[PDB]
Amino acid sequence: LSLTNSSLMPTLNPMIQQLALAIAASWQSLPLKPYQLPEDLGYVEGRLEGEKLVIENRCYQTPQFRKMHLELAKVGKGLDILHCVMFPEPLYGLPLFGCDIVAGPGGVSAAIADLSPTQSDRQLPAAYQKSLAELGQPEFEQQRELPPWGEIFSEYCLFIRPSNVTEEERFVQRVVDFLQIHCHQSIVAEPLSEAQTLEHRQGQIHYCQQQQKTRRDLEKAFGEAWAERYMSQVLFDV
């Protein structure tokens, strides 16, 4: 796992670069194994109205995380994207870590991050709540409203338009905190019963189903069949 061979990192919005480096630093601490995507989908290049569209996908796995995906994209000249999900192995009942940034050369327009509950409770595990509790509330001046296809998200979800670099740094630090808690608990987690495993797996199907609400730009560049394969095999496999 390493981003030093990325062709995109040097032209991506700096908060995106920061967050990618922070996710890498986190994941490098896990016993990562490679996760194979379709051969053509590791590195994607096309055109979107005459401007280069480029996507780099990196995917890993652990016994606790079925699929760890980091996507970076430059979707023509005025859109940069980071999308990251860690899909937990449902046997372990961990929450879904997710984060997305949408940016341009002018700055960041949306940043979101959560540890999303898989538990039919919609609660996070006790150890997460206690560790999260001791961090305290970060302050944000523009918090955005979740569409109806929330709250597959948790109470700790941040969904914002950063107002200045201090908010960019605060957003990234909260993701670094989320990851420190998450990785640590993954190392300590024990297999659930079959019943609760299936419960968690359904929470994961529902989370991926809901998130089908990105397509449009991919359809525009690649068509609808390519887009629907990408959504169902790369992004949000069910």
Using CB under 6 A as the criterion, which residues of the chain lie in contact with ligand BLA when the complex forms?
A: 55, 73, 75, 79, 81, 83, 100, 102, 109-110, 112, 211, 214, 217-218
Instruction: List phi, psi (to 5°) of 142.
Output: -125, 95
For ligand BLA, the closer of residues 192 and 237 by Cβ is 237
For ligand BLA, the closer of residues 86 and 91 by Cβ is 86
Q: What is the largest CA-CA distance in the chain?
A: 53
Min separation Cβ 102 and ligand BLA, Å: 4
Min separation Cβ 162 and ligand BLA, Å: 11
Min separation Cβ 15 and ligand BLA, Å: 13
- Beta carbons within 8 Å of 81's beta carbon, 6+ residues apart: 16, 71, 72, 73, 74, 75, 100, 101, 102, 103
Q: Are 88 and 200 in contact (CB under 8 A)?
A: yes
Q: Are 141 and 163 in contact (CB under 8 A)?
A: yes
Min separation Cβ 210 and ligand BLA, Å: 9
DSSP per-residue codes, 38-92 = PTTSSEEEEEETTEEEEEEEEEEE-SSEEEEEEEEEEESSS-EEEEEEEEE-GGG
For ligand BLA, the closer of residues 91 and 182 by Cβ is 182
For ligand BLA, the closer of residues 91 and 234 by Cβ is 234
Min separation Cβ 212 and ligand BLA, Å: 9
Report the SS3 class of residue 156: coil
For ligand BLA, the closer of residues 13 and 61 by Cβ is 13
For ligand BLA, the closer of residues 91 and 175 by Cβ is 175
Report the SS3 class of residue 112: strand
Min separation Cβ 112 and ligand BLA, Å: 5
For ligand BLA, the closer of residues 75 and 91 by Cβ is 75
> Chain-centre distance of CA 104, in angstroms?
19
Query: In which residue are the tokens 């997710």 written?
Result: 98
Q: What's the rounded Cα separation, in Å, for the pair 178 and 66?
A: 19
Min separation Cβ 79 and ligand BLA, Å: 6
